Design a protein around this nucleic acid. Structure first.
Ligand SMILES: [Mg+2]
Ligand SMILES: [Mg+2]
Ligand SMILES: [Mg+2]
Ligand SMILES: [Mg+2]
Ligand SMILES: [Mg+2]
Lengths: 135, 66, 167, 111, 171, 177, 154, 148, 113
DNA sequence: TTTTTTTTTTTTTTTTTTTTTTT
């Protein structure tokens, strides 16, 4: 994982298979998007369960404001996605929590949402099959 | 523009403030490829200033390489 | 570890096994409405079965304490954690976990509970990203809508003849 | 081999982010280019009349597996929007996309 | 060598089967907390030793940190955290967090000592747990615990002297 | 060399069955802390030397930190902690933490003396404890302890010095080389 | 070479048998440092000589990994110093031990002499304590209460 | 080459015999209570006698200036050095050497004295661990009583 | 082999004479030296004049592999200029270090007193 | 448009004097 050069057959299969646009079954709504678990499944079925890897380069908390007993949070996450050949795409994601009477729950929701969103938006750069044809 | 250098070379390039209603920012712009030659850039909205900073320093940087 | 290449047959077997879902014998529900989840120890068992006791590793990249607050003698704690899971070939997935303690009068107990819960939650979320077999199917609405021990062999002696003879 | 050197000069018909990504995925391949974020800086956040105004910078680096790379800059704004989180989200993402757009243009006319 | 010597098929299979097994009622201790069931750390040490051998596993402390030392009414309240890594002869590893605690002692050094020891012990227990049910992972299953609840040392050959004739002969 | 030499089958089996043993009542010391039981450090070193040999193990110190050096009524209170790593010829290892405590002394150099030596001793003892019952792991068991307390109290003995070394030269070792 | 040369069976057996011995009554010195109690010990040069005989002039080595001054203090014109060192002893095959030695200097009115004494004493104390883990022949037998109680009634 | 040359049985036995010898009165110095020692050149020549001109080496690992104090226009300096001696086989020893300069109003002279003295003190204290023929005997209280 | 016994039996003082001695004792291609560490002690430009102190570590190594490391030292005083003063201290320190390094080999190359 | 159950007791006394001239 880091120096496993692709073979020609698999290279062409991947290159052709990524351009296929996503059928109406996957998309759900206004804004049309893709659920995160569907994106994970598509990645697994596309590269293999051992063909891609993701990590968190860094994560920041932007603010925690309390207004009338409710907390408002915003979290930035840098999520990096790597392939077994050595290619990667890093992208940013954001998470928001509002109206929760608990600060810890708000932080948890925000951080996890930010990570999931960064993961979604990092895979799109690879091809249309994973979501680039959504806007 | 970068067209002259990209045609001739084929090169890669790496990378304060004032702030009311008027702006001017530094550069932090480098260039590579042969060895590197660094320059600096000037500006004239923050986006416009930073972008213009990056233009000119690259322009000057490429000249020195030449 | 870290440089062991999968064989074609093991590759295919794991690829087929990960692709499948979990029966109603792995999912439990708690009031929150209701939420369906998979317990951490069951996920550890599934990971062991899928990859083997020596097929996967997990590490804590970094933890941090978000806040400790005292109100009327009660401590409120929130702890984050980064957990990284790895496979023999090199592949890995890193995810975040969070822990919470609410109404404990002892700060040390609150920190302990929060940190341990954070590590467990992070591991659970990091194992999910490998397939449906490891918990990735419980957040799908369609599957959720569709769904809705003998101790004779229990170890009683320390010595393990089979392992020692095989050693 | 030697085909890209001639396939970069052609132009055809502002450019949307998805389209430049799609053209990026074609000349080089899904495994021929990578990009990364080097820095982000929330230059300012302001509140007026219950509406927030944000401006964010971003450093985006794009490398071909041959080695050549070009780091460039991008900016993002979010004016007249209640709530801070949406503002910051929009600004950061637009900054990253803009930096990516401007980074890729340095390799030739085609992009 | 350690960290670069592979398993064989037979040993590997035997260890899987052994690790899958659960633990009996004589490995389980109970304490008030309305009860709570657990496995003592030295028992886990023994199980790991005889599951992988005395030279089949290695543990280390990768980080320890004191969270707070507080004095109240002449008594110290301390809390410590430890990251313990357990590694196997092939290269596999599991890293978990342990936490120690001391409260009510009038001596600062004793509190730190107790807490810093408890941290590493607890972390080792929790890091060995994720290798199988045999190494304590079965204690977290409520069905197992309610199944155990529905159930009904005279070694004169102890080491008396210092030498090991058989070990010396083999060496 | 050390860390790159592997055990043979017979050697491994012998050490494995030996480390399983539990120590007798003549290794066990007692002190009031209710009474508590322990194994003294030099005995542990002797046991390790017998089990693995003088060239079969190796221990080091990875870090040492002073938690505090306080003064109260002219008397110093010190606390130190050490990370002691024990290793074997094949490559295996075990780490643990030892703590040294010193209190009551008017001198400050002596306080650090005692704390910093006690810490390394405790750390080595606990790092060797995780190799078997033979290196002290049995003392933690309540059943094994309540068994010993039921055994007869052995009277103290006196060692014989007729075999004690009295000359620097070692003719056997010299001939061996 | 040093650090990768293997002991033969006869040498291993000989050295193993020798290190198990308990030193006789002429190696034990004494002091009065218990406020009413006596303490036994072994001198440094004697331990170096014992090591040289046991392993040979080219069978062992030692080094200093780190040394640090805990404090240099002044009171009534007198200097008080405390220095600590970590000493590593190695054998021809690769085995090693490390322990801590500490030096003290209370009373002198010169800063340089105090530091000199503290540092040198700490290094020697460390070399003594590291060699102690190799066996009784190198001083491990002193800690025994029974062994000393036998010497004190000779 | 150096660091990887082994000793024959005869050479090792010969050196082992020699290093056990104690030192006669022609090597021991004295000063004012009374002290005894061995000079630096004496130990250097003894080492050249045992191991030969190409049979030993030494180097400096750490030299740190403990202080440079100035009082009454008079400097007080202190330098601590760590010196390492190794043989052709590969064996080595390391110990701490010290240098003290006091009373000299010239800063450079005090620094030079301390720096140069520390290396030689450490070199003497390093060679001592090889055997009695290189100064290890001097610590023997009984030996001094016999010679004195 | 005979060369070893010959050299061993063969084995203030003016500078270049010691370099000539080393040249004769071991030969033009039998020895080498190099500078390892350099340092400067105290302040400069006091009362017009300068005080400069430089200490150097020099390592002399023979063809077989033997070597010795010793410490030099350099002092510059009186000269009222930074230029060519610290350089003079550097040169003096290097030379003193080389002399003290060649000394430990044997009597033919030093061993004062 | 993500996502929302975990945590289960441990710790067991050690330390035992050295150093002292050179460029
Ligand atoms: Mg203790
Ligand atoms: Mg002492
Ligand atoms: Mg001196
Ligand atoms: Mg939760
Ligand atoms: Mg607990």
């Amino acid at each position: 994982f880091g120096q496993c050069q692709y073979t020609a057959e698999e290279y062409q299969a991947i290159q052709k298979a990524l351009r296929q646009r996503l059928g109406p079954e996957y998309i759900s709504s206004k804004v049309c998007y893709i659920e995160g678990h569907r994106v994970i499944n598509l990645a697994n079925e596309m590269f293999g369960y051992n063909g891609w890897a993701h990590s968190i380069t860094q994560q920041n908390v932007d603010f925690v404001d309390l207004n009338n007993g409710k907390f408002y949070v915003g979290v930035c996450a840098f999520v990096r996605v790597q392939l077994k050949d050595g290619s990667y795409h890093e992208d940013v994601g954001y998470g928001v929590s509002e109206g929760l009477k608990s600060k810890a729950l708000s932080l948890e929701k925000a951080r996890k949402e930010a990570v999931t969103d960064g993961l979604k938006r990092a895979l799109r750069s690879f091809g249309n099959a994973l979501g680039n044809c959504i806007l | 523009e970068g067209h002259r250098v990209i045609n001739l070379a084929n090169w890669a390039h790496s990378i304060f403030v004032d702030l009311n209603g008027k702006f001017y920012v530094g550069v932090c712009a480098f260039v590579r490829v042969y060895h590197e030659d660094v320059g600096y850039g000037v500006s004239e909205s923050k986006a416009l200033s930073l972008e213009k900073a990056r233009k000119e320093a690259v322009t000057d940087g490429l000249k020195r390489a030449l």
